[PDB]
Amino acid sequence: VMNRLILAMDLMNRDDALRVTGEVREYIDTVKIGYPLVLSEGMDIIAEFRKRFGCRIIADFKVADIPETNEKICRATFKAGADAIIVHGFPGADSVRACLNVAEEMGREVFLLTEMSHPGAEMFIQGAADEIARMGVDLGVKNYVGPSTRPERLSRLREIIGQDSFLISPGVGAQGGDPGETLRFADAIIVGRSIYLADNPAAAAAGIIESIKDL
Amino acid sequence: VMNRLILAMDLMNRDDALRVTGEVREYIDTVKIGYPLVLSEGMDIIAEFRKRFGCRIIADFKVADIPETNEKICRATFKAGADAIIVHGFPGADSVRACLNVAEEMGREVFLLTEMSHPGAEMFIQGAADEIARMGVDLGVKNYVGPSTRPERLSRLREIIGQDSFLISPGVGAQGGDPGETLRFADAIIVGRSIYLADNPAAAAAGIIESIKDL
Ligand SMILES: CCOC(=O)c1cc(=O)[nH]c(=O)n1[C@@H]1O[C@H](COP(=O)(O)O)[C@@H](O)[C@H]1O
Ligand SMILES: CCOC(=O)c1cc(=O)[nH]c(=O)n1[C@@H]1O[C@H](COP(=O)(O)O)[C@@H](O)[C@H]1O
After folding, report:
1. SS3 call for B86
2. Alpha helices in chain A (DSSP H)
3. CA distances, A143 to each of A146, A191, A207, B32, B201 (Å)
4. Is A167 in contact with A185 (CB distance < 8 Å)?
5. Which residue is closest in CA terms to ligand 2's atom 11?
6. Cα dihedral B21→B61→A70→B183 (10° resolution)
7. Cβ-Cβ contacts under 8 Å for A92 (sequence gap 6 or more)
8. Residue A32 CB-half CA count within 13 A
9. Structural domain total, chain B
10. DSSP 3-state of A43
11. Are A21 and A53 in contact (CB under 8 A)?
């Protein structure tokens, strides 16, 4: 991804979301869009962003249902133009396989969320996360998400998935993660509030990129 | 809920969804709407259903993000008119608390999903599910979801949450669960495909209700 930086666009107003994304477009090639924006403005926002900005769109929908419903969610998401979807691994292998099947059908990608970045992730997810990652490997998953807030976990995840797999990482900035440390293990970082709540989002993105180039 | 039966409306077309829901409305007072329908037709479908049918709407969004994003998802969902939202417990207590805070702010309800109904739930969720339920109790959660496909698990969940908590249960019909057995432990059953894919959905719903009355 351009500059190894993915914008997490979680503003809930189309005008604000379009303004900020346009301001930082010179510094990214990929926007993560999630439910805060889609549930506020509609699924048509994905194709609008894709067109206006010529970016790739990752739909961060944290898909976490039974296989049959997962199929439906993935199909709707790819029909709306998303390039990839983020899927939880905690519901197990059949749930993940259902997403992979739709992605194969529609020429798209699945990212497997293995261990989350917030404090509550320690309660249940962390203890399963190595297994969730190994499940991903055994299903043929090539794209993963793991936590900037715990780079030792992010190192262990990289160890399981190998060097060829693509790994993106949220929790940089607001949640306490560091760009440079996270990029020791992840291929790209996801950044939301540190950019989209900044007085000058372009300057915030530029500042991050400057520190990335320095790596 | 009327007749202890909740319709899982996962058709992806507004016309089909409206037709089936209207056909079975005499037999339910509550419709579960999830992402298959919302991502296909928009969040406005919730208020449309609420108005047309005068039902309660449970938004089955399986909320499973970090606390700050969970807040945003819940706020958007309640603004759209949903009476309650289904939340995953696997992301831990802060993620669940964020949903409870918004529900308290907006006079709504959270349902905690504790153990899922599909085969993959055995891999990671089942081993954490008793703890997830006890976490719910300790957070003050009063509404829960657990699996029709495993009534011995559904008995254990009821045991943890007590008799005053409200427990609803999917997996009846298509996934192999039985109405009567499930209602030994759950207060209401969720039924999707056995009704909405039936040649005569009203007759399917009526058949289920007849077996429920017999209990
Ligand atoms: C299931 C959500 O998927 C994610 O991308 C995600 C996983 C995770 O463990 N942590 C995490 O923060 N995210 C998402 O990544 C974004 C982080 O934004 P921010 O903290 O504002 O920089 C936000 O959209 C959040 O929902
Ligand atoms: C996270 C989804 O929340 C649920 O209600 C759910 C949890 C679960 O463990 N199992 C389960 O089947 N469900 C949902 O309940 C519905 C079951 O529909 P059906 O199998 O067609 O009768 C469907 O919407 C499914 O997504």
Report:
1. strand
2. 14-24, 35-41, 44-53, 67-79, 93-106, 125-139, 151-161, 179-182, 193-196, 201-214
3. 10, 18, 27, 32, 41
4. yes
5. B170
6. -60
7. A135, B118, B119, B120, B121, B122, B123, B124, B125
8. 24
9. 1
10. coil
11. yes
Q: Is the CB of B31 under 6 A from ligand 2?
A: no
What does residue A56 show for φ and ψ, rounded to 5 degrees? -90, 150
CATH for B21: 3.20.20.70
In DSSP terms, B88 is beta-bridged to B113
Range of the domain at B106: 1-215
Of B64, B37, B73, B200, the C-alpha closest to B124 is B64
Is A100 touching B (CB cutoff 8 A)? no
Bridge partners (DSSP) listed for residue B47: none
> In whole angstroms, what is the distance from residue B171 CA to residue B152 CA?
14
Q: Is B115's C-beta closer than 6 angstroms to any atom of ligand 2?
A: no
| B91 at A interface, C-beta within 8 A | yes
Spatial separation of the C-alpha atoms in residues A28 and A20, rounded to whole Å: 12
Contact between residue A115 and residue A155 where contact means Cβ atoms under 8 Å apart: no
Structure-solving method: X-ray
Q: Are B5 and B27 in contact (CB under 8 A)?
A: yes
DSSP state of A141: -
Identity at B182, one-letter amino acid code: T
B175 in contact with A, Cβ within 8 Å: yes
Q: Report d(CA A125, CA A155) in Å as an integer.
A: 16
Tokens of A65: 């249902």
Enumerate the residues of chain A whose CB falls inside 8 A of the CB of residue B77: 39
Phi, psi torsion values for B109, nearest 5 degrees? -125, 150
Rounded Cα–Cα distance for residues B110 and B103 (Å)? 7
Q: B164: which 2 tokens?
A: 């005053």
Structure tokens at B31: 């419709």
The answer to whether the CB of B129 is under 6 A from ligand 2 is no
Q: Of A12, A77, A120, which has the smallest distance from its Cβ to B91's Cβ? A: A120
Q: How many CB atoms lie within 10 A of CB B206?
A: 16
Task: Check: CB of residue B191 under 8 Å from CB of residue B182.
Answer: no
Indicate the resolution in Å: 1.6
